[PDB]
């Protein structure tokens, strides 16, 4: 019952019932003119000051949450790419917040990088607050996907022609590399944004995942998490499960 564990539990419990959007940031494999663009083909470290700061935050979040009791054989390239994506995802969120003149302190958010059985790397984002309403969900997904596709094309480490960069930009938008949780529906029928409950989804779902410690990653595992209160960031897997236990 460290102060960090108690602090995270309390912070989540206070936001147990806060409605938030659920997004997933992802990428998909692309081949353009024989050039293979895979999930980890975005390893340029762009020298924008904010992005650099965000990437350092991801690195230190990884470092502090690492359990050194056990060995970790995650590929260095994999870690690098995840740190970079953490910075890019958050840049996208912050760019849209700026568009709406939303003070970052008025926002609750949670980010978790995972490796899915079929899709591989992806990043869950829960985000909401007083300046948010359900009807804005579609707009948010579209805007986030604009910035996500823009940054991915900038960060891509594969040498691309201008025509190929534009094609890749189009693919990331048209194939919705940012998804929004909606209620189940029919292909023809309307899709309604499905808000989730912030604290509950974190404690009862995201904090139950198993930590990736190998390459290839364990199916369904998580790499790295963070939140707007820096509450879950530094927690080791064992501590995260304690938070779930105390939250109940
Ligand atoms: Na970068
Ligand atoms: Na994170
Ligand atoms: Zn996932």
From Swiss-Prot:
Q: Where is this motif: RCR-3?
A: 205-209
- Locate the coiled-coil region(s) and give their ranges: none
Q: Which domain of life is it from?
A: Viruses
UniProt PTM comment: Phosphorylated.
Active-site residues per Swiss-Prot or TrEMBL entry: 205 (for nuclease activity)
Q: Where in the cell is it found?
A: Host nucleus
- Enumerate the residues binding a divalent metal cation: 114, 122, 124
Start and end residues of each PV NS1-Nuc domain: 16-248
Annotated spans, Ori-binding? 186-190
Q: Where is this motif: RCR-2?
A: 122-124
- Provide the residue span(s) of the region labelled DNA-binding: 1-248
What the record says about family reads:
Belongs to the parvoviruses initiator protein NS1 family.
What do we know about how this protein assembles, alone or with others? Answer: Homooligomer; when bound to DNA. Interacts with human SYNCRIP. Interacts with host transcription factor SP1; this interaction allows high levels of viral P38 promoter transactivation by NS1.
UniProt domain comment: In the N-terminus, the endonuclease region is involved in binding to the origin of replication. In the middle, there are the ATPase and helicase activities. The C-terminus probably contains a transactivation domain.
What is this protein's function?
Multifunctional protein which displays endonuclease and helicase activities required for initiating and directing viral DNA replication. Also plays a role in viral packaging and transactivation of several promoters. Binds site-specifically to 2-3 approximate tandem copies of the tetranucleotide 5'TGGT3' within the origins of replication (Ori), unwinds this hairpin region and nicks one DNA strand thereby initiating the rolling circle replication (RCR). Cooperatively binds Ori with host PIF and probably other host factors, which activate the nickase function of NS1.
Q: What's the protein here called?
A: Initiator protein NS1
Q: Which organism is it from?
A: Murine minute virus (strain MVM prototype)
Range covered out of full length: 6 to 253 of 672
